[PDB]
């Protein structure tokens, strides 16, 4: 009929995926012969959009440089669209995101309000779709390096986009129009994508240049891993770029072959090109992709500028033969389209895959229409209705994450050879209303649970085999209760035999218990080694949390039986079931507040430890451990102590009492002192110095350690430094005659701990007597350890 | 091809015990194609492995930057030890080697003088507290302002200027509301330089 | 290959009627082999033919070539662009360098003279200080004088961008303490396009 009534049939058959894999191309408006610049002069006569061939399913109108009053726009509307529609090519207008977000265009003419953004959306559809005579709209949402878009801008863009989705697209008033987003942002940094994905026909991801890894597609596979949650693979399209003329560093991608001086036609060869790679590339998961697209299709066939020009720039410009403009045959585009349509994966699902026509129909509607979808589909399949006789071909859905069998009344048999390999790796299996099913064989599928099988609706059951699975059928298990129902169902039709109720040879998998009981462990002072893991943090559980402490408990578990029929596999070793507790570490804080990492403790003396057990990534258990009568937990009495004097920087001295090891104190010398005030008199039993190398911020060499020092207390037990003048206080604390040593340091240890003779003192001083080298010594923390 | 730039530590960081000085090494214009950039650091020709390489930073399309930051010991820097940064890459013919050390020459102690506002400036809502530092060498120096123990932050300092005697001088200009000046608050001009005792002096400035 | 540097006029020369301002264009590292260096001068993209090229100067086997264009005070102060274009055989393409005066609302400098610090008075030479602040653009000239005669033992800081978008600097005249204490008057002369007749003077004597 009309240019609009023909275009509606293109869009419909494109949307329903009847074209096979798609090829698309961004035509640069300023390379059409009808295009004119601001001075009303022609820019390039060599090429036109009308010559784009039928192998291009979608041609994107990509606008810049073409002046807005150019005759081009009439030619596009009145001439090109008609010509292109005759072969079955759709036109789509590409606009930038800044058209929506307020930065440019009609968005600066409408307020950022619910009603304003709606009216803008409608203005955009008219301006860029209706008036231009094209078949859809493509919004380009790219990565900004410099003037990144404000959250307020992106939020507006999305709101405007969602309003456009009401007017055009799969979910719009007008469904004769495609709605597309192209982007260069990953899902994690693409909030607009997340919001509009449900309304998109296609996402076009530009992947020009290498994308990392040996096969240069790392970023594509990683991105798809996220994209797949929001769109189907049938909506996903990856793009390469042709060589643009006079392109400098920043726009040199090498997606097509380089110039060859002996083969003018090398640019038209697609062999060993990223273009061919993208045509060939498919997602691991979800299904086959929609297709590929090219940037600057008007440059189809032109060889890339040689690698030697890789770093040419706008100023430092080294031009080349290939920077000249040329007519194109679209040779590369047609080769890439033919390649994809000749790919065997896009062959349709036939009776050789799924025999049953009723099942074939439903699988096609849910997973896709191509052979290569079956391999990849990794979501849910819901099979329904009384037309399905047999489930042959369902095994091809290797990655299926869930299978729901709902009211399949003419299905009489379920065998393990019918179900997909994903069932052996914990895919979900639901079946409800299986009124015709008489035989349920789920043997050898490593089923860890019987969840999903609505046993009450399986009313015509006569036999079942759930043997060679990974079930826990112990007394207090849900799975045993489900088995009991399966047997009661069978017993309604015939006496329960071994020939119709197989449930033996279970190899239930082992897991770490979620919580351990011991919150307060105890040992005698037996002068023996004990192991905290074997004694207190031990054991394995099933999927149903059945605890097996040791080999002996596993033996009792194996002896378990239903109707005197042992259900566990006899050939199943404890070594297999048990967890090995590999890489479990035990962190021990003593009463000393000294830390060690060991599961061993030799019970020589009275002690108490706090025990934090780590699997390797997280703490799985805390408890206390008293050796003998125990010891009372000391505290760092020096924590937050007031500095009252020092030979160095006063503010820096305060970092010895902050409780971190993220900063150090030193002076321009090998000697220094810091005097400090614990605020009250308390019983000091030990002290601890964390030396220079304990620094947790800068990797500090031990040559910066304190080699020799002295901890001291003030002589005058009851002197009021309170009431002393600042000037006198300094002279007083500086004078060595007022201080008695209480501890000595003679070793450049990373951590130095020694005991004190039950020292009662408010005021303390620590002198550094020398370093481990000529480098001025540092230390990070000082503890005075005892009871309050 | 990739270039290399080697920046010295901030003079305050070399002189102040509270701070950790860093030599920084920047590699610009790294290609997407061959992205691996290995750094080797030397201190008087002795390899050190304590450096810390930050991950690449796309500057523009398909072109990255890579920074490596080596912590330095105050003494090593001030004793004028050479810091060599060596960069390797596939898109380099040979590795690139850049070296920096401290400015050599007989140190001269800065003289710090604080100057009050001009009578003529007192007609304005904000007045200019001035600090003159003169006769110092080398030109590595740091100037800060303070008042009542809190940092004053609305100031600007001139670059060092070579005086006629071969030493350097500069001016720092703290701007304060006239109210605060007239009320008789004390302001401090802190100067940090290698030729000062503890690399530090403070001069005060209040209304007479 | 050859490099090009284009220097603006001395700010006093643009501001004073007695003086003739000049834009100067220097080409360094010219080879002995291909020595011909052609200059073209443009004022707002309009070629001017009144330039004056000085002959080569061995700065080995490498020459330097300077070309000096006289400018009209008004043209400079109205912010006209001066383009210098250099040609050479050992250049792939000609080199084009441009300078103009910084565009922006001019702002009048405030000149304050500051006497020595009490603490400096213990020394045989003391520092007379002149603060110039709040001026735009940064083109400025500072001189000292006393009893009508120029004082010449001074140094001035480069302009520094202040937090309000204007510039400031300090000039520091050094005098024997004797001359300061004897009560001589010193003058700080400031020359800038935003001053009346591009000139003011502030005095400084013992108080
Ligand atoms: C960075 O790369 C990405 C692609 O890579 C992707 O991201 C990277 C990080 C990796 O992850 C990749 O794997 C991944 O694939 C670029 O994105 C696409 O890339 C191509 C080029 O590779 C771009 O083509 C260029 O487009 C400009 C015009 O671009 C419009 O659209 C942009 C985004 O929408 C927007 O940023 C632009 O500003 C511009 O937008 C428009 O603005 C005008 C008003 O200014 C408005 O009227 C329009 O409506 C509006 N259009 C919109 C919004 O779509 C184009 O100019 C470029 O071509 C010039 O340069 C070529 C040589 O490099 C040359 O051959 C061309 O002829 C042309 O040059 C000029 O010709 C004219 C006329 O003869 C002449 O007057 C000029 O003097 C002359 N100028 C110069 C200097 O050469 C080029 O085609 C796509 O825009 C972009 N998006 C899509 C959807 O394809 C990204 O652009 C790259 N960034 C940079 C800075 O290059
Ligand atoms: Ca600390």
Numbering used by the authors:
A (entry chain D): 45 to 832
B (entry chain A): 237 to 444
C (entry chain B): 237 to 295, 297 to 444
Task: Copy text from the publication.
The glycosyl hydrolases EndoS and EndoS2 cleave the β1−4 glycosidic linkage between the first two N-acetylglucosamine (GlcNAc) saccharide residues to shed the main portion of the glycan, leaving a single GlcNAc variably modified with α1−6 fucose. EndoS and EndoS2 are multi-domain enzymes, comprised of a catalytic glycosyl hydrolase (GH) domain, a leucine-rich repeat (LRR) domain, a hybrid immunoglobulin fold (hIg) domain, and the so-called carbohydrate-binding module (CBM); EndoS additionally has N- and C-terminal 3-helix bundles.
The crystal structure of inactive EndoS2 (containing D184A/E186L substitutions to abolish catalytic activity) in complex with IgG1 Fc substrate was determined by X-ray crystallography to a resolution of 3.0 Å. E382A substitutions were introduced into the Fc to discourage crystallization of the Fc only, as previously utilized  (55). The EndoS2-Fc structure reveals how W712 binds within a hydrophobic pocket at the Fc Cγ2–Cγ3 interface, formed by I253, H310, L314, N434, and H435. We observe an atypical Φ dihedral torsion angle of 5.9° for the β1–4 glycosidic linkage between the two core GlcNAcs. While the basis for Fc recognition by EndoS2 was previously unclear, the structural data presented here now reveals the different orientations of EndoS2 towards the substrate compared with EndoS, providing evidence for distinct modes of substrate recognition by these two enzymes.
